[PDB]
A = this chain, B = another copy of it.
Amino acid sequence: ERKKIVSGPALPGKLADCVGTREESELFIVEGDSAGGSAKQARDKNFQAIMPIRGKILNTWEVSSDEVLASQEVHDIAIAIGVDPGSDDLSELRYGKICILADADSDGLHIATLLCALFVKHFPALVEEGHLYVAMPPLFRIDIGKDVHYALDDEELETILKNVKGNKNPQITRFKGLGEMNAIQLRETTMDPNTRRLVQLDLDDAHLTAGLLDKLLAKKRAADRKQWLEQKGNLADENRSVAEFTEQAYLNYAMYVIMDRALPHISDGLKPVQRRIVYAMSELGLKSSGKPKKSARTVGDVLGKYHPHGDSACYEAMVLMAQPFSYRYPLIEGQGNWGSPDDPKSFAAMRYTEAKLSAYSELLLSELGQGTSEWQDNFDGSLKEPITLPARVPNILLNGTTGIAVGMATDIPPHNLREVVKGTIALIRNPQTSDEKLAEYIPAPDLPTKAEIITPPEELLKIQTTGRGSYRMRAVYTIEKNEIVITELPYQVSGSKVITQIADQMQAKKLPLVVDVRDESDHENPTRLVIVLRSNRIDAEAVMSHLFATTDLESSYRVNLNMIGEDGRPQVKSIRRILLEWIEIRKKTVTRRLQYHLNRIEKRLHILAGLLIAYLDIDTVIRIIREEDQPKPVLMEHFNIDEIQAEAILELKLRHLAKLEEMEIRHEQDELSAKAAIIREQLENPESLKNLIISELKEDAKKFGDERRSPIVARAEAVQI
């Protein structure tokens, strides 16, 4: 039972009510920030009411009806519509239609599904009696000069397109947010009964509907939901079933956030914000060979052109890929306080630090302009951006990844570039290389520290073959007189925290043999934590063994090799499967690059053939250029060259044309013909394509590769007290 109102306004100052016969009345539930003010101005006050809600309501799917009014938003909804949760009595229903008005993007879709869930669980009678609707946002925007048009479906788009004839070219884009519209556009597209597309939601079979919603929204269905994402994830973008509507809305929401925050793409090992940073820096000209610019410059361009979602989220992602203690192969570099292992979240603001691309980042970017990638509209349709980067190495394993969204997590450790290349080459030569044979090439992760991996070979193998498990690391130290001197910490472990843990044991009187702990790290000593013992007599190993058991000096790391595959689906994959799948991606990239270069080679040979003809009667060419007002047609007629060939001859300076050597031309012709011949056979013979990729992997491992940093070492179990 909701709070009673007989006298006065329902929800004063929140609900903007209408003045209507309530069966003709319509309530629009909107999101406040995105469309609150605009919807109120868009509506017809005679029969349309607006209730703005700030942000998303809670997930009420598993909340008992006896308990659901505890939420204010929900209480307000029940008051607005005049129905108690869990009741089938609609005699107090205040509107004939209850309409969800939400954006077309991931957040709007999420808001829509949470509202449907509320109505399906707690007001099923309302939905069964046909009172719940969705006000569909446009599907497309169409710009024509200064004119903006919206299409709510494929028919309207075709109609719009065929009826504008004339000059301007129509730019079509996918519609995102209602907040982009003025009140007139919003009225015309979503609120006016004559022109909107208002879809009535059907409960259908209430048991199947509940079953589907259980899967989307219930905690106990976590496993079902994960399997659903792994099967259907690639599919993420009048009457309609509520089950069909919410399944597709929530699929779209879930895949968006999972790809945004959690799982990178297998092809280049990146998530969108990371890919957009690297791409944006490439366009800014921030090559490793030049000067860095303030990080702000890159952030501003990312925010303005590619990833408009908060300066902080962009900059924090930049920092991570600049920290040499975080990224095994930094994508970014430059002067500034990028923080330290003591606290990787404490770093200078983006107006101070400076950033350009690292040389390593060439492995992702160098082939971008060579017809290798697919491109898509950026968020507002004014630019294109690459969907994936044409990686020359499996950066996914080299820098790894971490994140979680909607219960789906990933935890990929970094690996050594040279070991991974050896493994990849083996897999290209023999796809049936076993998991165990692969482990000889790639024994373990390789972290940006010289600390030790102490996990046994057979546990490392199980992690690699199943894509999940755990490994352990220990700090590295030596003994000097009465001092334990630690020079290397486990990955992601803070020296300051370690010192705090040890000091705490000292104060708790648990470490009598330790008299002091000092942080002696400085420029001469990157990491230098000193544990001072009572005397030279004390058994340091025994002290260290206890510390390994009780502090971060020994640490454990979850591994979950989860990512978006070439098929667009999330999946946990073995090391072997990751590399096999990556190889197949690289074959496609290289094939496309070869095709791009062949075309260019052929165009250049065509020019050279013209230049050879020109050179072989240079005096006539020169005479024609000197004495003709229109040399081009004269050259074409008298030498039998085409327009392209003639323009190239005319392109040259008279001075250059005199300097034109036959030998030079003929050499380039020969050199280009032999290149084109090699390319054609690489394109036609799969085995020589494989050899090309192998030789390129070898050169890249030589140029950009480095030695293992984290030795794999067996240790006696840590012993406490």
Q: Which residues of A contact B (CB under 8 A)?
A: 7-9, 12-14, 16-17, 19, 32-38, 40-45, 48, 52, 54, 143, 146, 148, 176-185, 187, 290-291, 293-294, 296-305, 308-311, 335-340, 342-343, 346-354, 379-380, 382, 496-500, 502-503, 506-507, 515-526, 528
Which of B35, B185, B342 meets A348, CB within 8 Å? B35
In the A-B complex, the 6 residue pairs with the closest CB atoms: A300-B304, A179-B348, A37-B340, A12-B503, A13-B500, A308-B351
Task: Please measure, in the bound complex, the distance between the C-alpha atom of A147 and the C-alpha atom of B554, giving whole angstroms.
Answer: 42
| Residues of the B chain whose Cβ atoms lie less than 8 Å from the Cβ of A37 | 337-340, 342-343, 346-347
Report whether A296 and B300 are in contact in the complex, using a CB–CB cutoff of 8 Å: no
| Residues of the B chain whose Cβ atoms lie less than 8 Å from the Cβ of A146 | 290-291
Which of B19, B179, B507 meets A349, CB within 8 Å? B179
| Residues of the B chain whose Cβ atoms lie less than 8 Å from the Cβ of A176 | 351-352
Report A73 CB to chain B, min CB distance, Å.
Answer: 16
Residue on B with the closest CB to A520?
B45
Given contacts A308-B294, A335-B185, contact A521 B178 (CB under 8 A): no
| Residues of the B chain whose Cβ atoms lie less than 8 Å from the Cβ of A349 | 33-34, 177, 179, 308
Report whether A516 and B9 are in contact in the complex, using a CB–CB cutoff of 8 Å: yes
Task: Please measure, in the bound complex, the distance between the C-alpha atom of A179 and the C-alpha atom of B152, giving whole angstroms.
Answer: 51
Residue on B with the closest CB to A31?
B348
Which of B13, B38, B516, B526 meets A337, CB within 8 Å? B38
Report whether B351 and A309 are in contact in the complex, using a CB–CB cutoff of 8 Å: yes
Report whether A352 and B522 are in contact in the complex, using a CB–CB cutoff of 8 Å: no
Which of B19, B32, B304, B348 meets A301, CB within 8 Å? B304
Instruction: Indicate the member of A16, A521, A528 with the most B CB atoms within 10 Å.
Output: A16
Given contacts A179-B352, A300-B304, A521-B40, contact A8 B506 (CB under 8 A): yes
Which of B13, B54, B299, B507 meets A497, CB within 8 Å? B13
Which of B45, B185, B304, B340 meets A528, CB within 8 Å? B45
| Residues of the B chain whose Cβ atoms lie less than 8 Å from the Cβ of A294 | 308, 379-380
Report A488 CB to chain B, min CB distance, Å.
Answer: 16
Report A239 CB to chain B, min CB distance, Å.
Answer: 29
Given contacts A496-B13, A503-B8, A518-B9, contact A41 B340 (CB under 8 A): yes
Report whether B518 and A17 are in contact in the complex, using a CB–CB cutoff of 8 Å: yes
Report A335 CB to chain B, min CB distance, Å.
Answer: 5
Report whether A40 and B522 are in contact in the complex, using a CB–CB cutoff of 8 Å: yes
| Residues of the B chain whose Cβ atoms lie less than 8 Å from the Cβ of A35 | 337, 348
Report whether B9 and A45 are in contact in the complex, using a CB–CB cutoff of 8 Å: no
